[PDB]
Coordinates of C-alpha atoms and ligand atoms in Angstrom, one line a residue:
Chain O
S1 CA 3.9 -90.4 -3.2
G2 CA 6.1 -90.9 0.6
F3 CA 3.4 -91.3 4.2
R4 CA 4.1 -89.4 7.1
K5 CA 3.0 -88.3 10.3
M6 CA 1.2 -85.7 9.4
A7 CA -0.1 -82.8 11.8
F8 CA -2.5 -80.3 11.7
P9 CA -1.6 -76.3 10.8
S10 CA -1.1 -75.3 14.6
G11 CA -1.9 -71.2 13.2
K12 CA -5.4 -70.9 14.4
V13 CA -4.9 -73.2 18.1
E14 CA -0.9 -70.6 18.3
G15 CA -3.7 -67.4 18.8
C16 CA -5.7 -69.0 21.9
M17 CA -3.0 -69.8 23.6
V18 CA -3.1 -68.3 27.0
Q19 CA -1.2 -68.4 30.6
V20 CA -3.4 -68.7 33.2
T21 CA -2.2 -68.1 37.1
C22 CA -4.0 -69.5 40.1
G23 CA -1.3 -68.5 43.5
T24 CA 1.2 -71.0 42.8
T25 CA 0.5 -72.9 39.8
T26 CA 1.5 -71.8 36.4
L27 CA -1.1 -73.3 33.8
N28 CA -2.4 -73.5 29.8
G29 CA -6.0 -71.9 28.6
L30 CA -7.5 -72.1 26.0
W31 CA -9.4 -68.5 25.6
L32 CA -11.7 -68.7 22.6
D33 CA -14.8 -65.9 22.7
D34 CA -14.5 -64.0 26.2
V35 CA -14.2 -67.7 27.7
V36 CA -11.5 -69.0 28.4
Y37 CA -10.9 -73.1 29.1
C38 CA -7.9 -74.7 32.1
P39 CA -8.3 -78.0 33.6
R40 CA -10.2 -77.3 37.6
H41 CA -7.2 -78.7 39.9
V42 CA -5.4 -74.7 38.3
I43 CA -7.1 -73.9 41.5
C44 CA -5.1 -77.4 44.1
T45 CA -1.8 -76.8 46.0
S46 CA 0.4 -80.5 45.8
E47 CA -1.5 -81.4 49.3
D48 CA -4.6 -80.7 48.1
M49 CA -4.2 -83.4 45.3
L50 CA -4.4 -86.0 46.9
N51 CA -8.3 -85.4 47.7
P52 CA -9.3 -82.6 46.3
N53 CA -12.9 -80.5 47.1
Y54 CA -13.1 -78.7 44.3
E55 CA -16.7 -77.4 44.7
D56 CA -15.4 -75.5 48.2
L57 CA -12.1 -74.9 47.2
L58 CA -14.1 -72.5 43.9
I59 CA -16.2 -71.1 46.3
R60 CA -12.5 -69.7 48.6
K61 CA -11.5 -67.8 44.9
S62 CA -12.1 -65.1 43.9
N63 CA -12.1 -62.9 40.1
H64 CA -9.3 -60.9 40.6
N65 CA -7.2 -64.9 42.7
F66 CA -6.9 -66.0 39.0
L67 CA -4.7 -64.2 36.2
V68 CA -4.9 -64.4 33.1
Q69 CA -2.0 -63.5 30.2
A70 CA -2.6 -63.2 27.0
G71 CA 0.9 -62.2 25.3
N72 CA 2.4 -59.1 27.2
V73 CA -1.4 -58.5 27.9
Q74 CA -2.7 -59.2 30.7
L75 CA -7.2 -60.7 30.6
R76 CA -9.2 -58.8 33.5
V77 CA -11.2 -61.5 34.7
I78 CA -14.4 -61.0 34.8
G79 CA -16.6 -64.5 36.4
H80 CA -15.7 -67.9 37.3
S81 CA -17.3 -71.8 37.1
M82 CA -16.9 -75.5 36.4
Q83 CA -17.7 -77.3 33.8
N84 CA -17.1 -81.2 34.4
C85 CA -13.1 -80.7 35.3
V86 CA -12.7 -77.5 32.9
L87 CA -12.6 -74.4 35.2
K88 CA -14.1 -72.2 32.9
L89 CA -13.0 -67.6 32.8
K90 CA -15.5 -65.3 31.8
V91 CA -12.9 -62.6 30.6
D92 CA -13.0 -58.7 29.7
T93 CA -11.4 -58.4 25.5
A94 CA -13.0 -61.5 23.3
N95 CA -10.3 -63.6 21.2
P96 CA -9.8 -61.1 17.7
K97 CA -7.2 -64.0 16.9
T98 CA -10.7 -67.0 17.8
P99 CA -11.3 -69.3 15.1
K100 CA -14.6 -71.2 13.6
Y101 CA -14.7 -74.0 16.0
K102 CA -15.8 -76.3 17.3
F103 CA -16.2 -78.8 20.6
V104 CA -16.5 -83.0 19.6
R105 CA -15.9 -85.7 21.7
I106 CA -13.5 -88.3 20.1
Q107 CA -13.8 -92.0 20.1
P108 CA -10.3 -94.9 20.9
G109 CA -9.5 -94.7 16.7
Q110 CA -9.8 -91.0 16.4
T111 CA -6.7 -89.2 15.5
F112 CA -5.2 -85.8 16.8
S113 CA -3.0 -82.9 16.8
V114 CA -1.4 -81.9 20.0
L115 CA 0.0 -78.7 20.3
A116 CA 2.1 -78.3 23.3
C117 CA 2.5 -75.6 25.8
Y118 CA 4.1 -73.7 28.5
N119 CA 3.3 -71.1 30.2
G120 CA 0.8 -69.5 27.3
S121 CA 3.7 -71.0 24.7
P122 CA 3.1 -73.1 21.8
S123 CA 6.6 -74.9 22.5
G124 CA 5.6 -77.5 19.8
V125 CA 3.7 -79.8 17.8
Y126 CA 2.8 -83.3 17.3
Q127 CA 0.0 -86.2 16.0
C128 CA -1.5 -88.9 18.3
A129 CA -3.9 -91.3 18.6
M130 CA -6.9 -91.7 21.6
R131 CA -5.8 -95.2 22.6
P132 CA -8.2 -98.6 22.8
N133 CA -7.7 -97.6 27.1
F134 CA -8.0 -93.9 26.7
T135 CA -5.0 -92.8 27.3
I136 CA -2.6 -90.6 24.9
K137 CA 0.8 -90.9 24.3
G138 CA 2.0 -88.4 23.9
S139 CA 5.3 -85.5 24.7
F140 CA 5.0 -83.9 28.0
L141 CA 6.3 -82.2 30.8
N142 CA 5.8 -80.6 33.4
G143 CA 4.0 -77.0 32.9
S144 CA 2.5 -78.2 29.7
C145 CA -1.2 -78.9 31.5
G146 CA -4.5 -77.1 29.5
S147 CA -2.9 -77.4 26.3
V148 CA -4.8 -79.0 24.1
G149 CA -5.6 -81.6 21.0
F150 CA -7.5 -80.7 17.3
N151 CA -8.9 -81.3 14.2
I152 CA -9.0 -78.9 11.6
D153 CA -11.3 -80.0 9.0
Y154 CA -12.0 -76.9 6.3
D155 CA -12.2 -73.8 8.3
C156 CA -12.7 -75.5 11.4
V157 CA -10.7 -76.2 14.8
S158 CA -12.5 -79.1 16.1
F159 CA -11.2 -79.6 20.2
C160 CA -11.0 -82.5 21.1
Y161 CA -8.7 -83.0 24.2
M162 CA -7.5 -81.4 27.6
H163 CA -4.4 -82.0 28.6
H164 CA -4.7 -83.0 32.2
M165 CA -2.2 -85.6 34.3
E166 CA 0.4 -88.6 33.2
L167 CA 0.1 -91.4 34.4
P168 CA 3.3 -93.7 36.4
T169 CA 3.3 -96.0 32.9
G170 CA 4.1 -92.3 31.3
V171 CA 1.3 -92.1 29.2
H172 CA -1.1 -89.0 29.5
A173 CA -4.9 -88.3 30.5
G174 CA -7.4 -85.3 30.3
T175 CA -10.6 -84.4 28.7
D176 CA -13.0 -83.5 26.4
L177 CA -13.4 -79.3 26.3
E178 CA -16.6 -79.3 28.7
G179 CA -14.1 -80.9 31.3
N180 CA -15.3 -85.2 31.0
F181 CA -12.4 -87.4 31.0
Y182 CA -11.4 -89.6 28.6
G183 CA -12.0 -94.2 30.1
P184 CA -12.0 -93.9 34.2
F185 CA -9.7 -91.5 35.4
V186 CA -9.9 -89.0 37.8
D187 CA -8.6 -85.1 38.2
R188 CA -7.1 -86.3 41.8
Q189 CA -3.7 -87.9 42.9
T190 CA -5.1 -91.3 42.9
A191 CA -3.8 -95.8 42.9
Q192 CA -4.9 -95.5 38.9
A193 CA -3.1 -96.5 35.7
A194 CA -3.7 -97.0 32.5
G195 CA -5.4 -100.4 30.9
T196 CA -4.3 -103.1 29.1
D197 CA -3.5 -101.2 25.7
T198 CA -4.8 -103.0 22.1
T199 CA -3.7 -102.4 18.8
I200 CA -6.4 -100.0 16.7
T201 CA -7.1 -103.1 14.1
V202 CA -9.3 -101.1 11.9
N203 CA -6.1 -98.6 11.4
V204 CA -3.3 -101.2 11.0
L205 CA -6.1 -102.4 8.4
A206 CA -6.0 -98.3 6.5
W207 CA -2.3 -98.0 6.8
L208 CA -1.7 -101.5 5.0
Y209 CA -4.0 -100.0 1.8
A210 CA -1.7 -96.9 2.4
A211 CA 1.1 -99.0 1.1
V212 CA -1.0 -100.6 -1.1
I213 CA -1.4 -97.1 -2.8
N214 CA 1.8 -96.6 -2.2
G215 CA 3.5 -99.5 -4.6
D216 CA 3.4 -101.8 -1.8
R217 CA 2.2 -105.0 -1.9
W218 CA 5.1 -108.3 -0.2
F219 CA 2.6 -108.7 2.2
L220 CA -0.5 -110.4 0.2
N221 CA -1.2 -113.3 0.1
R222 CA -3.8 -115.6 -1.5
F223 CA -6.0 -116.0 1.9
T224 CA -9.2 -114.7 2.8
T225 CA -10.8 -115.2 6.8
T226 CA -14.6 -115.0 8.1
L227 CA -14.6 -111.3 10.1
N228 CA -15.2 -113.7 13.1
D229 CA -11.8 -115.9 12.8
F230 CA -9.8 -113.1 12.1
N231 CA -10.8 -111.9 15.7
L232 CA -10.1 -114.7 16.9
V233 CA -6.8 -114.8 15.8
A234 CA -6.6 -110.8 16.4
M235 CA -7.6 -110.5 20.3
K236 CA -4.4 -113.5 20.3
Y237 CA -1.9 -110.9 19.5
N238 CA -3.5 -107.5 21.8
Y239 CA -5.4 -105.8 18.6
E240 CA -9.3 -104.9 18.9
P241 CA -11.5 -106.1 17.7
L242 CA -12.6 -105.6 14.2
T243 CA -16.8 -104.6 13.3
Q244 CA -18.8 -104.9 10.7
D245 CA -19.0 -100.8 11.5
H246 CA -15.4 -101.0 10.7
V247 CA -15.0 -103.2 8.3
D248 CA -18.2 -100.7 6.1
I249 CA -15.5 -97.5 7.2
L250 CA -12.3 -99.8 5.1
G251 CA -15.0 -99.8 2.3
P252 CA -13.6 -97.0 0.0
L253 CA -10.2 -98.1 0.4
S254 CA -11.1 -102.0 0.2
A255 CA -12.8 -100.4 -3.7
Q256 CA -9.9 -98.6 -5.0
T257 CA -7.1 -101.0 -4.2
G258 CA -9.6 -104.4 -5.4
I259 CA -8.4 -105.7 -1.6
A260 CA -11.6 -107.0 0.0
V261 CA -10.9 -105.7 3.7
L262 CA -11.1 -110.2 4.8
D263 CA -8.2 -110.2 2.2
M264 CA -7.2 -107.7 3.9
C265 CA -7.7 -109.4 6.9
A266 CA -5.5 -112.7 5.6
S267 CA -3.2 -110.7 5.3
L268 CA -2.2 -108.4 8.3
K269 CA -3.6 -112.1 10.5
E270 CA 0.2 -113.9 8.2
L271 CA 1.7 -110.8 9.4
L272 CA 1.2 -111.3 12.6
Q273 CA 2.2 -115.0 12.4
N274 CA 5.8 -113.7 10.3
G275 CA 6.4 -110.7 11.6
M276 CA 8.9 -108.3 8.8
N277 CA 11.8 -111.0 7.8
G278 CA 13.7 -108.0 7.5
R279 CA 11.0 -105.5 6.1
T280 CA 9.1 -102.5 6.6
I281 CA 6.3 -101.6 4.7
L282 CA 6.5 -97.2 4.1
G283 CA 9.8 -96.9 6.5
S284 CA 8.8 -99.1 9.0
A285 CA 9.9 -102.3 11.1
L286 CA 6.4 -102.4 13.1
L287 CA 2.7 -101.9 12.6
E288 CA 1.4 -98.5 12.7
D289 CA -1.8 -98.1 14.3
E290 CA -2.4 -93.6 14.8
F291 CA -3.5 -93.3 11.1
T292 CA -7.4 -93.5 10.8
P293 CA -9.3 -94.7 7.3
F294 CA -10.3 -90.6 7.1
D295 CA -6.5 -90.3 7.1
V296 CA -5.3 -92.5 4.6
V297 CA -7.8 -91.2 2.3
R298 CA -7.2 -87.4 3.2
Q299 CA -2.7 -87.5 3.1
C300 CA -2.9 -90.7 -0.3
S301 CA -3.2 -89.9 -3.8
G302 CA -6.6 -90.5 -5.1
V303 CA -4.2 -93.1 -8.3
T304 CA -2.2 -96.1 -6.9
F305 CA 0.9 -97.0 -8.2
Chain I
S1 CA 7.0 -88.2 29.7
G2 CA 6.6 -89.4 26.0
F3 CA 8.9 -89.0 22.9
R4 CA 7.6 -87.4 19.9
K5 CA 8.9 -86.4 15.9
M6 CA 7.6 -83.0 16.9
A7 CA 7.9 -79.2 14.7
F8 CA 7.8 -76.3 15.2
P9 CA 4.1 -74.9 15.0
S10 CA 3.6 -73.2 11.5
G11 CA 1.4 -70.0 12.9
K12 CA 3.7 -68.2 11.4
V13 CA 4.7 -69.5 8.8
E14 CA 0.8 -70.1 7.5
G15 CA 0.5 -66.6 7.4
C16 CA 2.7 -66.2 4.4
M17 CA 1.6 -69.0 2.0
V18 CA 0.2 -67.6 -1.4
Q19 CA -1.1 -69.1 -5.2
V20 CA 1.1 -68.9 -7.5
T21 CA 0.1 -69.4 -11.9
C22 CA 2.1 -68.5 -14.8
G23 CA -0.7 -70.6 -17.5
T24 CA -1.9 -73.7 -16.3
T25 CA 1.0 -74.2 -14.1
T26 CA -0.2 -73.6 -10.0
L27 CA 1.4 -74.6 -7.6
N28 CA 2.7 -72.2 -4.2
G29 CA 4.8 -68.7 -3.1
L30 CA 5.7 -67.2 -0.4
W31 CA 4.5 -63.9 0.5
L32 CA 7.6 -62.2 2.2
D33 CA 7.1 -58.5 2.5
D34 CA 6.5 -57.2 -1.1
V35 CA 8.2 -60.7 -2.9
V36 CA 6.4 -63.5 -3.5
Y37 CA 9.3 -66.4 -4.0
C38 CA 8.7 -69.6 -5.8
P39 CA 10.1 -72.2 -7.9
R40 CA 11.5 -70.5 -11.6
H41 CA 9.7 -74.2 -13.0
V42 CA 6.3 -72.2 -12.2
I43 CA 7.2 -69.9 -15.8
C44 CA 7.4 -74.2 -17.2
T45 CA 5.6 -76.3 -19.7
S46 CA 5.0 -79.8 -19.8
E47 CA 6.9 -79.6 -23.0
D48 CA 9.3 -77.2 -21.8
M49 CA 11.2 -79.4 -18.7
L50 CA 13.0 -81.1 -21.1
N51 CA 15.4 -78.6 -21.5
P52 CA 14.2 -75.1 -19.9
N53 CA 16.3 -71.9 -20.9
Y54 CA 14.5 -70.2 -17.3
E55 CA 16.6 -66.8 -19.4
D56 CA 14.1 -67.1 -22.7
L57 CA 10.7 -67.8 -21.0
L58 CA 11.1 -65.3 -18.1
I59 CA 11.9 -62.4 -20.7
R60 CA 8.9 -63.5 -22.3
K61 CA 7.0 -62.6 -19.8
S62 CA 5.0 -59.5 -18.7
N63 CA 4.2 -58.4 -14.7
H64 CA -0.2 -59.8 -15.5
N65 CA 0.9 -63.0 -16.4
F66 CA 1.7 -64.3 -12.9
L67 CA -1.3 -64.4 -11.0
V68 CA -0.8 -64.5 -7.1
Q69 CA -3.8 -65.1 -4.5
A70 CA -3.2 -64.5 -1.3
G71 CA -6.5 -66.3 0.6
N72 CA -9.6 -64.6 -1.4
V73 CA -6.8 -61.7 -2.5
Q74 CA -5.7 -61.3 -5.7
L75 CA -2.0 -60.0 -5.6
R76 CA -1.1 -57.2 -8.4
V77 CA 2.3 -58.2 -9.3
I78 CA 4.1 -55.4 -10.6
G79 CA 7.9 -57.2 -10.8
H80 CA 10.0 -59.6 -11.9
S81 CA 13.2 -61.8 -11.2
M82 CA 15.4 -65.1 -10.8
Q83 CA 17.8 -65.8 -8.0
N84 CA 19.5 -69.1 -9.2
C85 CA 15.7 -72.1 -9.5
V86 CA 13.8 -68.5 -7.9
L87 CA 11.4 -66.8 -8.9
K88 CA 11.3 -63.5 -6.5
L89 CA 7.5 -61.3 -7.7
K90 CA 7.9 -58.0 -7.2
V91 CA 4.1 -57.6 -5.6
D92 CA 2.1 -54.2 -4.6
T93 CA 1.0 -55.5 -0.8
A94 CA 3.7 -55.8 2.0
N95 CA 2.3 -59.1 4.4
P96 CA 0.9 -57.5 7.7
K97 CA 1.5 -61.0 8.9
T98 CA 5.2 -61.0 8.5
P99 CA 6.8 -62.0 10.6
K100 CA 11.0 -61.8 12.0
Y101 CA 12.6 -63.8 9.1
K102 CA 15.6 -65.2 7.7
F103 CA 17.1 -67.4 4.4
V104 CA 19.7 -70.2 6.0
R105 CA 21.6 -73.0 4.6
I106 CA 20.9 -76.1 6.1
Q107 CA 23.5 -78.4 7.0
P108 CA 22.7 -82.6 6.0
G109 CA 21.5 -83.9 9.4
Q110 CA 19.5 -81.6 10.5
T111 CA 16.3 -81.4 11.0
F112 CA 13.3 -78.7 9.9
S113 CA 9.4 -78.3 9.9
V114 CA 7.3 -78.6 6.8
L115 CA 4.1 -77.3 6.1
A116 CA 3.4 -79.2 2.9
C117 CA 0.7 -76.5 0.7
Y118 CA -1.2 -77.4 -2.3
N119 CA -3.3 -74.1 -3.5
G120 CA -1.6 -71.5 -1.3
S121 CA -2.9 -73.9 1.2
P122 CA -1.0 -75.6 4.0
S123 CA -2.8 -79.2 4.3
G124 CA -0.6 -80.3 7.1
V125 CA 2.8 -80.4 9.2
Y126 CA 6.1 -82.7 9.7
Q127 CA 9.4 -82.9 10.2
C128 CA 11.8 -84.4 8.7
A129 CA 15.5 -83.9 8.9
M130 CA 17.9 -83.4 5.3
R131 CA 19.3 -86.9 4.6
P132 CA 23.5 -87.2 4.1
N133 CA 22.3 -87.6 0.2
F134 CA 20.8 -83.9 0.0
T135 CA 17.3 -84.9 -0.3
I136 CA 14.2 -84.4 2.3
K137 CA 11.3 -88.1 3.3
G138 CA 8.8 -86.0 2.7
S139 CA 5.4 -86.5 2.6
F140 CA 3.6 -84.7 -0.7
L141 CA 1.2 -85.2 -3.9
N142 CA 0.7 -83.1 -6.8
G143 CA 0.5 -79.5 -6.1
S144 CA 2.9 -79.1 -3.2
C145 CA 5.6 -77.9 -4.9
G146 CA 7.0 -74.6 -3.2
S147 CA 6.0 -76.3 0.3
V148 CA 8.4 -75.2 3.0
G149 CA 11.2 -75.9 5.5
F150 CA 11.6 -73.4 8.3
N151 CA 13.2 -74.4 11.4
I152 CA 12.2 -71.0 14.7
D153 CA 14.0 -69.6 16.6
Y154 CA 12.6 -67.5 19.9
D155 CA 11.0 -65.2 17.6
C156 CA 12.4 -66.1 13.9
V157 CA 11.2 -67.9 11.2
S158 CA 14.8 -68.7 9.9
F159 CA 13.2 -70.6 5.9
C160 CA 15.8 -73.3 4.8
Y161 CA 14.0 -75.7 2.8
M162 CA 11.6 -74.8 -0.6
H163 CA 9.8 -77.8 -2.0
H164 CA 10.8 -77.9 -6.3
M165 CA 10.5 -81.9 -6.7
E166 CA 10.0 -86.0 -6.2
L167 CA 12.6 -87.9 -7.2
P168 CA 11.6 -91.8 -8.7
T169 CA 11.7 -93.6 -5.4
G170 CA 10.1 -91.2 -4.2
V171 CA 11.5 -89.1 -2.3
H172 CA 11.8 -84.9 -2.6
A173 CA 14.8 -82.6 -3.6
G174 CA 14.5 -78.8 -3.6
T175 CA 16.8 -75.2 -2.6
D176 CA 17.4 -73.2 0.3
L177 CA 15.1 -69.8 -0.2
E178 CA 17.9 -67.8 -2.4
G179 CA 17.0 -70.7 -5.3
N180 CA 20.1 -73.2 -4.5
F181 CA 19.4 -77.0 -4.6
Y182 CA 20.2 -79.4 -1.8
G183 CA 22.2 -81.5 -3.6
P184 CA 23.4 -82.7 -7.3
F185 CA 19.7 -81.8 -8.6
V186 CA 18.7 -79.7 -11.5
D187 CA 14.6 -78.3 -11.9
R188 CA 14.4 -80.2 -15.2
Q189 CA 12.5 -83.4 -16.1
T190 CA 15.9 -85.2 -17.0
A191 CA 17.5 -88.8 -15.5
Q192 CA 18.5 -87.9 -11.7
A193 CA 18.4 -89.8 -8.6
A194 CA 19.6 -90.4 -5.4
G195 CA 22.4 -91.2 -3.7
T196 CA 23.0 -93.9 -1.6
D197 CA 21.9 -93.1 2.0
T198 CA 23.8 -93.4 4.9
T199 CA 22.5 -93.3 9.0
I200 CA 22.6 -90.6 10.7
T201 CA 25.3 -91.4 13.1
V202 CA 25.5 -87.9 16.4
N203 CA 21.0 -88.0 15.9
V204 CA 21.0 -91.7 16.6
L205 CA 22.9 -91.4 19.6
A206 CA 20.9 -87.9 20.9
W207 CA 17.9 -90.4 20.1
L208 CA 19.3 -92.9 22.1
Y209 CA 20.1 -90.9 25.4
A210 CA 15.8 -89.2 25.4
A211 CA 15.6 -92.4 25.2
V212 CA 18.6 -93.2 28.6
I213 CA 16.0 -89.8 29.4
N214 CA 12.8 -91.6 29.4
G215 CA 14.0 -94.4 31.6
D216 CA 15.4 -97.1 28.5
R217 CA 18.4 -98.0 29.9
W218 CA 18.1 -102.5 28.3
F219 CA 21.3 -101.4 25.5
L220 CA 23.6 -100.1 28.0
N221 CA 26.3 -102.2 28.3
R222 CA 29.8 -101.8 30.5
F223 CA 32.1 -101.5 27.7
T224 CA 33.7 -98.1 26.1
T225 CA 35.3 -97.6 22.4
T226 CA 37.8 -95.2 21.8
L227 CA 36.9 -92.6 18.3
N228 CA 38.5 -95.2 15.5
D229 CA 37.3 -98.2 16.7
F230 CA 33.5 -96.3 16.3
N231 CA 34.1 -95.7 13.1
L232 CA 35.6 -98.9 10.9
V233 CA 32.4 -100.3 13.0
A234 CA 29.8 -98.1 11.1
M235 CA 31.7 -97.7 7.9
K236 CA 30.9 -101.2 7.8
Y237 CA 26.4 -100.9 8.4
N238 CA 26.7 -97.1 5.7
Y239 CA 26.7 -95.1 9.4
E240 CA 28.3 -91.9 8.9
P241 CA 30.9 -91.2 10.6
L242 CA 31.2 -89.5 14.2
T243 CA 33.9 -86.7 14.3
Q244 CA 35.2 -85.3 17.5
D245 CA 32.6 -82.1 16.7
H246 CA 29.8 -84.9 17.2
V247 CA 31.4 -85.5 20.4
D248 CA 31.7 -82.5 21.5
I249 CA 28.2 -81.7 21.0
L250 CA 26.8 -85.3 22.4
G251 CA 28.5 -83.3 25.9
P252 CA 25.4 -82.0 27.1
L253 CA 23.5 -85.2 26.7
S254 CA 26.2 -86.7 28.5
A255 CA 26.2 -84.8 32.0
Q256 CA 22.9 -85.4 32.1
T257 CA 23.1 -88.8 32.1
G258 CA 26.5 -89.4 33.0
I259 CA 26.8 -91.8 30.0
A260 CA 29.7 -90.8 28.4
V261 CA 29.5 -90.1 24.6
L262 CA 32.4 -93.6 23.5
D263 CA 30.2 -95.3 25.9
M264 CA 27.0 -94.8 24.5
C265 CA 29.7 -95.1 21.0
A266 CA 29.2 -99.1 22.2
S267 CA 25.8 -99.7 23.4
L268 CA 25.6 -98.7 19.3
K269 CA 28.3 -101.1 18.1
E270 CA 26.1 -103.3 20.4
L271 CA 22.9 -103.1 18.4
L272 CA 24.3 -102.4 15.0
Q273 CA 26.0 -106.0 15.4
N274 CA 23.5 -108.2 17.0
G275 CA 20.2 -106.1 17.2
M276 CA 17.1 -105.8 19.0
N277 CA 15.9 -109.2 19.7
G278 CA 12.5 -108.9 20.1
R279 CA 12.6 -105.0 21.6
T280 CA 12.6 -102.0 21.5
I281 CA 13.4 -97.9 22.4
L282 CA 11.3 -95.4 22.8
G283 CA 8.4 -98.0 21.0
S284 CA 10.7 -98.8 17.7
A285 CA 11.7 -101.6 16.1
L286 CA 13.9 -99.2 14.0
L287 CA 17.6 -96.9 15.3
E288 CA 16.2 -93.6 14.6
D289 CA 18.0 -90.5 12.8
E290 CA 16.3 -87.4 12.4
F291 CA 16.3 -85.9 16.3
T292 CA 19.4 -83.9 16.2
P293 CA 21.1 -83.4 19.6
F294 CA 19.1 -80.1 20.1
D295 CA 15.6 -81.0 19.3
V296 CA 16.5 -84.1 22.5
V297 CA 17.1 -81.4 24.3
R298 CA 14.2 -79.3 23.4
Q299 CA 12.6 -81.5 23.8
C300 CA 13.3 -82.9 27.2
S301 CA 13.8 -79.5 28.6
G302 CA 10.3 -77.6 27.1
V303 CA 11.6 -74.8 25.0
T304 CA 9.0 -72.8 23.5
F305 CA 7.6 -69.4 21.0
Ligands
RVR1 O1 -0.7 -85.5 36.4 C1 0.0 -84.5 36.9 N1 1.0 -83.5 36.6 C2 2.0 -84.4 34.7 C3 1.2 -83.2 33.9 N2 1.2 -83.7 32.2 C4 2.9 -83.6 31.7 C5 4.1 -83.9 33.2 C6 2.7 -83.9 34.3 C7 3.3 -84.3 35.5 C8 5.2 -84.4 35.7 C9 5.0 -85.0 34.2 C10 5.2 -85.4 33.1 C11 -0.4 -83.2 37.5 C12 0.9 -84.0 39.2 N3 0.9 -85.5 39.2 S1 0.1 -85.8 39.9 O2 -0.3 -87.6 40.3 O3 -0.5 -85.1 41.8 C13 -2.0 -85.3 39.5 C14 -2.8 -86.5 39.6 C15 -3.7 -85.8 38.6 C16 -4.1 -84.7 37.8 CL1 -5.6 -84.6 36.6 C17 -2.7 -83.6 38.6 C18 -1.7 -84.3 38.7
CL2 CL1 -14.4 -90.2 16.5

């Protein structure tokens, strides 16, 4: 029993964190094989951030302008190239602690663990979700740039995020490991803001199925709904539209509990209408949206209580 | 910016997790140097759990009765002894990945990270607090026994918890690494329940100081209070009494924000009486008590390991 927001063990990623310095800027890098990946704004000053010409700033740099430090050892840089918003530094030593890895681009609603680092040194790990507006509600201070997001399924680390910036509202934006930003963000100090955020509906439903598995049924009702009628209500509460793909993905949880997806949608419709009335679901007074249907199956038992 | 429940990087602990099997029982062990530490109930059957004479069960066992598996390699057991409720298995091989460590007993209110394991294989990491009633609200399924709790201080891992059992309310009980239980619990199938729990007041105040640092000030007021008057109100909402030690420990957060501890106590007094009124603090509708004053400082400063 028990339901916690759980991050993946950070060990396979800890052995990849290095410190990258270019002149006066110091952020984190990810050392995989003989390549170190870090944000391309490491080559930028605070004046350069308003309108940076990265191709023009990179052409003026040589390998020895980048200092890479893995623990107490200096790695020699023997090449440099740019791929979108990430800088790829070819180093002379292959990382002996390189795990089995993949670079994956995630979609809004997907969750991941973040290993927050400062000066190539990991300081903490936490779980979070890619928001529908493409931002992440993370915990990042100055110097955390280059901290990475990941999932570890089986013996494979799937890198899905690299931290690049903080928006004016305190939320965070960054790229996949190929340097492509999530959302309409640029690595430029411009007037950009996060779009209106919506609740990840398929994740709230998954968390309601997890509550039923842990013996919580107070929120269930004798009602059902059409998929269309549910969406007309949910969107009035800034909930993300629920697609037929979402209903299909919730299939195994519906079968395990014996509560049809549209029957759980009627419980959510009523929860939005009435609130909790002093009650909690899995120790929470709010409706949780950072657990995917796949996370619920991973953490929760196969036997319902 | 950002405030997340953050666990320590689990890497130094991951390299210590082994699988311990005795007959039909399979749980986790902690391999430090040439000793493997695991719950002593690994030597127990389901009939033995009712009234187990552990000295009598252990005298009937030989070294080869315990199978220890580190990754895909079998460790040969060459000795066995008991220390309170933990079994110490002397192995032939010293762990090459043994970190700098200490065994420490924590006090209720102190927090720690848990690396949840099944079959000597880590599957997740999460942060939690030792409740005032000595239980932990964790996330554990069958096979989790022997999962350990820890903090990191520089390069030193401080082991403070080993999981033993789940209580009928879904909460968890376990021992320090010397086999001494946290709470009035015993390692056996018997009628035991968690006592009435209280809110860790010094931790709620620390989390209110973290909200002010992140730009949340709606709960602040012009009022102050005496330590005695605050404790009379706290005693009514099942909150831990606040001592002068707690006030002293909150000193640095009081200086950083410019809000005296008794001024923050007047704000908490008003949240306990009148509620939140549709508002949230750091994205929460409940008052959070699993962040110590040190955790607030470490997360809002960037302390690396
Ligand atoms: O956003 C940025 N840094 C940063 C990253 N993570 C966490 C935190 C910060 C700043 C302090 C607070 C915590 C920088 C500088 N500020 S900026 O607006 O010039 C900017 C813009 C784009 C890019 Cl890609 C980068 C940046
Ligand atoms: Cl995805």
